[PDB]
Design an enzyme around this catalytic site. Structure first.
Site, mmCIF file in Angstrom:
data_model
loop_
_atom_site.group_PDB
_atom_site.id
_atom_site.type_symbol
_atom_site.label_atom_id
_atom_site.label_comp_id
_atom_site.label_asym_id
_atom_site.label_seq_id
_atom_site.Cartn_x
_atom_site.Cartn_y
_atom_site.Cartn_z
ATOM 1 N N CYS A 19 1.144 11.015 -100.288
ATOM 2 C CA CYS A 19 0.374 12.061 -99.623
ATOM 3 C C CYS A 19 1.083 12.544 -98.366
ATOM 4 O O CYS A 19 1.737 11.767 -97.665
ATOM 5 C CB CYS A 19 -1.029 11.550 -99.288
ATOM 6 S SG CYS A 19 -1.986 11.266 -100.790
ATOM 7 N N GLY A 76 1.076 6.454 -102.004
ATOM 8 C CA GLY A 76 1.805 6.616 -100.758
ATOM 9 C C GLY A 76 2.473 7.964 -100.551
ATOM 10 O O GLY A 76 3.098 8.173 -99.506
ATOM 11 N N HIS A 80 -7.408 13.246 -94.839
ATOM 12 C CA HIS A 80 -8.050 12.049 -95.396
ATOM 13 C C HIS A 80 -7.375 10.750 -94.951
ATOM 14 O O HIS A 80 -7.817 9.667 -95.341
ATOM 15 C CB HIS A 80 -8.160 12.115 -96.931
ATOM 16 C CG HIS A 80 -6.853 12.122 -97.678
ATOM 17 N ND1 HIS A 80 -5.900 11.130 -97.552
ATOM 18 C CD2 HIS A 80 -6.382 12.967 -98.631
ATOM 19 C CE1 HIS A 80 -4.884 11.387 -98.359
ATOM 20 N NE2 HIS A 80 -5.153 12.495 -99.029
#
Ligand code: 5Z7
Ligand code: 5Z7
EC number: 3.4.19.12
Lengths: 306, 306
Positions: free
Chosen positions: B145, B143, B41
Site C-alpha cells: 500500500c 505491504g 488507512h
C-alpha cells in the site's frame, strides 16, 4: 496477488548511462568509476562495417576523437583500450553515482532487466530472458547500442548484457561486460543467423506454479510422470529437457503449493498434447517461458532491494 | 524493432519512497518537498477496518504517533492533515531529490508505470492500464500500500495512482494523489466488487499497428468498414465503442503504415468473428489492449526522457 512481467527498479543504472560519440557515430556508454564501456563498433564508418579490422581502426584514433557526455557535463577522455568487443574509455572523473556492481555472464534461460537508452538518456525498462540460442527478444531502435541488461542482488547491480546489434530475424545480440559475445555472433555487418530456439521448460513449470498460487487450477490433474517419460514428450515439442537440478530449483514452489514437480510435469504433458482449448493461464493463451523460478518466488512471496 | 511491455525508468520516483509506520501498521509513503503522502488507512487498527470513522481516528493521533523513515534517516513529523483518502504528513526536511512533478487523474484505457514497494524500498516496476471498470490488474503483496503509479513527460513525473487495496477478485484499487478513489470503491474492509470489464478497443487497434510495423501482417485484408458497422460488432464482444476521436489519435500510426483506421477495423472485425486459428500476433495468442497509441509510437518511433 497478481502476476506481471516485472523489471528491476532502474535508478541505480540510470545514473551510469552516458553518450559516446566517435566521428559521426553516437551511442550509449556505461560509466562506472573512471571507465566508460561501450560497443567497439562505435569506431567503425560505413566502409569498415562489412569487414572491420578493429586493431587498425583503434590505433588510428586519439583520445580527442572520443566525445563523452554525461547529461551536459563533458567527460575528458584520458585513455582508451579495447577488451574483446568492448571499448574501455578512461575518463578524468570518477562517476560519483557508481553503485556497488559486478560483471556476470548469465546462462540461457535466465532473465534480466534491460534499460533501453538513446543518446545516453534512459527511455524504458523491460524484462527479458536469454534464449537457448543466445539471442534476446528485445525492443530496440536505431541508437540503442550500448544499452545494458542487469539484475539487482540485494544492493549490488550485476551487469550481464550490453547491446550490440539486431539480427535479420528481428532478435538481438550482444556481449557480457567483458566484451565476450553471447552466442556465435561477431560485430560485423554480415549476414548472421541465430540457431533454432527451444522453449525453456523449467521456466514454464515455474509459471504454472505462479498460476496455481494465483488461483488458476484448471489444468491440474491427479496423474504423475517420470523425468524420462516427460523428457521424451518434451523433446517432441522443442522443449529443453528437464534435469534433477531443475526439480530441486522448483522445490520452494512445490512446497508452497503442495504439488510435486513430477505432478506438474504431467499437467504440462497434457497441455502440450491437447492444447489449452480456448482457456487461458494467468491471462495468456500460450505457455510462458520467460519467468524463472526465482522470478516467481520474488513476485509471489516477496523480495525488496535496498 | 521488437515490442515489449515497457515501463518508464523509475529512478526519479525511487528517491521519493519512504516507509510510514503508525502503531503496528507499516506501509509506503511518497515524499515530495516537505510532505509525505500515504493511504489514510494506515491509522486503522483491526477494530476500525470494517467501519472506520477517519475523522475520529485522526483527531486521536499526535505527530509523534507517525514514524517516517527514508532509508535510515528518520523524518520528524511536524504536522498532519487528511485530504480525502490520503494522509498528508508535513515533515521537517524537504526531499532534496524531489523531481519536477504534477498530480494528474488519468482516464480508463490510459497506461502508467507502477513502482511496487515494500517497507519504503522499491521492489519492481511494471506497466499496466486503468481498466474501464476503474481497477488495475496489478501485482501486489501484503505491504505494498502506498506504492505509486506514474508517467514521465519530458523531465516531469506525472503521479496518477496510489495503491490502497486488493479486491476479492484479485484486482487492485486506489486513488489519485488528491485522494479521490478511481471507481466506486471506499477504504473500508467491506465486500466490494468491480463492475464488468470491457476490452479497450482503441488500444487493440494501436497494438495491431505495432504488429504491422514489426512484420506481422497475416490478419490484414482488403475490406473496409464504417464506424457504425464496426461498433455494432464490437458491442457484441464486450468491446468499447470506437469514436472519431479514437480514429484521429490513431492517425500517426495509419500514416506510418499506409493502412487506414477503418481498414484496420475490418481486420479486427474478422479476428473477433473467426478467432486467430492457432496463429499469434507479436507473440500473443490473444488480442492485447494495454498499449495506448502513444505507447506504440514511443516504442516503434522513439522517445527518450532527460
Ligand atoms: O542502433 C542500431 C540498432 C540496434 C537495434 O537493435 N535495432 C536497430 O534497428 N538499430 N544500429 C544497428 C547496428 N549498428 C552497427 C554498426 C556497426 C557494426 Br560493425 C554493427 Cl555489427 C552494427 C549500429 C546502429
Ligand atoms: O498490503 C495489503 C495488500 C495489498 C494488496 O494489493 N494485496 C495484498 O495481498 N495485500 N493490505 C491489504 C489492504 N489493507 C487494508 C487495511 C485497512 C483498510 Br481500511 C483497507 Cl481498505 C485495506 C492493508 C494491507
Amino acid at each position: 496477488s497478481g502476476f506481471r512481467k516485472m523489471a528491476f527498479p532502474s535508478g541505480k543504472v540510470e545514473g551510469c548511462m552516458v553518450q559516446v560519440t566517435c566521428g559521426t557515430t553516437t551511442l550509449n556508454g556505461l560509466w562506472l568509476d573512471d571507465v566508460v564501456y561501450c560497443p567497439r563498433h562505435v569506431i567503425c564508418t560505413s566502409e569498415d562495417m562489412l569487414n572491420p579490422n578493429y586493431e587498425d581502426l583503434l590505433i588510428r584514433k586519439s583520445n580527442h576523437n572520443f566525445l563523452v557526455q554525461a547529461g551536459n557535463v563533458q567527460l575528458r577522455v584520458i585513455g582508451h583500450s579495447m577488451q574483446n568487443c568492448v571499448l574501455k574509455l578512461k575518463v578524468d572523473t570518477a562517476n560519483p553515482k557508481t553503485p556497488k556492481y559486478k560483471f556476470v555472464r548469465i546462462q540461457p534461460g535466465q532473465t534480466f532487466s534491460v534499460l533501453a537508452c538513446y543518446n545516453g538518456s534512459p527511455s524504458g525498462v523491460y524484462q527479458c530472458a536469454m534464449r537457448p540460442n543466445f539471442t534476446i527478444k528485445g525492443s530496440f531502435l536505431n541508437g540503442s547500442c550500448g544499452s545494458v541488461g542487469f539484475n539487482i542482488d540485494y544492493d549490488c547491480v550485476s551487469f550481464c548484457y550490453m547491446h550490440h546489434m539486431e539480427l535479420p530475424t528481428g532478435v538481438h545480440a550482444g556481449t557480457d561486460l567483458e566484451g565476450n559475445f553471447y552466442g556465435p555472433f561477431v560485430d560485423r555487418q554480415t549476414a548472421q543467423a541465430a540457431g533454432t530456439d527451444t522453449t525453456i521448460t523449467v521456466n514454464v513449470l515455474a509459471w504454472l506454479y505462479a498460476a496455481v498460487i494465483n488461483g488458476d487450477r484448471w489444468f491440474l490433474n491427479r496423474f504423475t510422470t517420470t523425468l524420462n517419460d516427460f523428457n521424451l514428450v518434451a523433446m517432441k515439442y522443442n522443449y529443453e529437457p528437464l534435469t534433477q537440478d531443475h526439480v530441486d530449483i522448483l522445490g520452494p514452489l512445490s512446497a508452497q503449493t503442495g504439488i510435486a514437480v513430477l505432478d506438474m510435469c504431467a499437467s504440462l504433458k497434457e497441455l502440450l498434447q491437447n492444447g489449452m482449448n480456448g482457456r487461458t493461464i494467468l491471462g495468456s493463451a500460450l505457455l510462458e517461458d520467460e519467468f524463472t523460478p526465482f522470478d516467481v518466488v520474488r513476485q509471489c512471496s516477496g523480495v525488496t532491494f535496498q
